[PDB]
Every structure is written in C-alpha cells, then in structure tokens.
Design a protein around this ligand. Structure first.
Ligand code: B87
Ligand code: B87
Length: 225
C-alpha cells in the first residue's frame, strides 16, 4: 500500500523546491507534479487565456486542472513503485486545494458565477465519489509561509505574468490554508480529512539553510502514519 501525501502551501511558498529535495532521497519516494505547475513557462493553453481574461476562463481552467490532476495521480498509483512495503507518493497539492482554496477563491472574486460554481462543485463531488477511495490522503504536508514571503518569492521566480499579483490575494489564500490546515475550521465535503494528520513546516527562512531539518521532520512524520 502506497502512502499518499499532499504538499500544500501558498503561491511560491516553496512547493517545487521542497519536492526537489524530497525526490532526491530514495527509490521508494516519488513525486506527482501539479498540472498548473507544469503549464507555467498543448491543452495547458488555458493558462495563457487565464492571464488575459480570468472571468472568462476560470471554470474551464479549474475544470481542466483538476481532471489533469486526477488522471496523473491515478496514473502514478500504478507503478512500478507499488513496492516495497514503504512506498510513498507525494502529491503536489490535492483535489481539495483545487476546490477549497483556488476554485473557491475564484468564485468569491467573481471570476465564476453561481452557476459555474455549482456545476464545478457538482462535477468535483461526483469525480471524487468515483475515485475518492483511490486518491485518499494518508497525510498532508503544509508549507507555511507569510503572504510577504510568498510575494517576494513570486518576484524572485520571475514569471512576468505573475508580477501583478497583489498581496491581498496572497493574504486570502493564506487565510484559507490556515483555516483548513492549521485551525481545521474550514469544512469540506470529505469528512476523512478531519482525521488526516498534518505536518506544518515553516518555510519562511531560506530553504538552503533548512532543507535538512525539513527532511528530518518529514521522515519523523511519515513513520507515524
Ligand atoms: O473583478 C475583477 C476580476 N478579477 C478578480 C481578481 N483577479 C483574480 C485573478 C486570479 C487569477 C489569474 C490567474 C491566471 C493564471 C492562472 C491562475 C490564475 S488565478 N485569481 C483570483 N483573482 C483578477 C481578475 N477584477 C478586480 C481586480 C482586477 C479586475
Ligand atoms: O491557479 C492555480 C495556482 N495559481 C494561482 C496563482 N496564479 C496566478 C495568479 C494571478 C493573479 C491573482 C490575482 C488576484 C487579484 C488581482 C490580479 C491577480 S493576477 N496571476 C497569474 N497567476 C497561477 C498559479 N491553481 C489551480 C488549481 C491548483 C493551483
């Protein structure tokens, strides 16, 4: 049985960096990269459209992202990794953050209307009632950084289309992560996530001085599942 762990965090919190550290350690540990992570630079063409007109493309973008996520995560469960006896699969984000952080935020910002938002939820619920068992998480790693840490890391990473991201937006996604993963006050449609263990890592400092302590904490955490 492959342990499934998602890595969660705000934009440019350091998910990729963290995944880069994790994917280096051993045979038994493998990462499932995030669709929207890959797009960022054919279908992933929805990204360019989102850059121009988010009110137009949000529903299409989130729908495609989540379906891409679901297939890649399902795909990945079928190694040639199904062994041996402590295989771990790391998910870059999850179907939950897709919905309760991102799609959710896009509706609150009026980039999806009531109808788009109802359809998306209807669609999301169904999908996960059809594959929830397969993709159920054994753990969540929360990469905790401040909105300002994230704003600065957006700047450093250099994507020209990301340079207009306001801090208020990062603050919103921050509240939602805190609310879901630290305070566990955000209620979802998936009651098994109320039990799911959560490792919260402060990633505000430079990863280069920290990645060792970080891995140490992850192993510690994995062994307790
Ligand atoms: O009413 C709106 C529409 N709007 C809400 C805030 N915005 C956003 C954009 C995004 C995104 C833009 C984008 C682009 C690529 C991939 C993911 C994303 S998510 N997410 C939340 N709010 C910009 C557009 N506006 C208020 C600020 C500018 C226009
Ligand atoms: O869309 C994302 C992640 N993501 C959101 C932030 N991104 C953005 C956001 C924005 C903006 C957010 C925002 C908010 C207010 C006003 C203008 C803007 S522009 N612009 C470009 N890329 C791309 C990556 N995901 C979809 C599913 C899981 C991750």
């Amino acid at each position: 049985r492959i342990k499934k762990i998602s890595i969660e965090g705000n934009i440019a919190a350091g998910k990729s960096t963290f995944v880069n550290i994790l994917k280096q350690l051993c045979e038994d540990w493998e990462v499932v990269p995030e669709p929207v992570a890959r797009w960022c630079n054919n279908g992933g063409n929805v990204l360019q459209m989102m850059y121009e007109k988010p009110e137009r493309w949000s529903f299409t973008f989130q729908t495609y992202a989540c379906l891409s996520r679901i297939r890649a995560q399902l795909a990945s469960l079928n190694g040639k990794l199904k062994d041996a006896e402590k295989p771990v699969l790391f998910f870059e984000r999850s179907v939950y953050s897709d919905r309760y952080i991102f799609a959710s935020n896009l509706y609150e910002s009026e980039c999806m209307n009531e109808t788009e938002w109802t359809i998306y939820q209807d669609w999301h619920d169904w999908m996960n009632n059809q594959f929830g068992q397969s993709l159920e998480l054994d753990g969540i790693i929360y990469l905790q950084a401040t909105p300002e840490t994230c704003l600065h890391r957006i700047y450093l990473r250099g994507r020209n289309e990301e340079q207009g991201i306001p801090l208020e937006y990062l603050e919103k996604l921050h509240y939602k992560h805190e609310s879901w993963l630290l305070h566990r006050t955000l209620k979802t449609n998936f009651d098994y996530l109320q039990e799911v263990p959560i490792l919260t890592l402060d990633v505000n400092e430079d990863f280069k001085d920290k990645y060792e302590s970080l891995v140490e904490k992850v192993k510690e955490f994995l062994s307790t599942l």
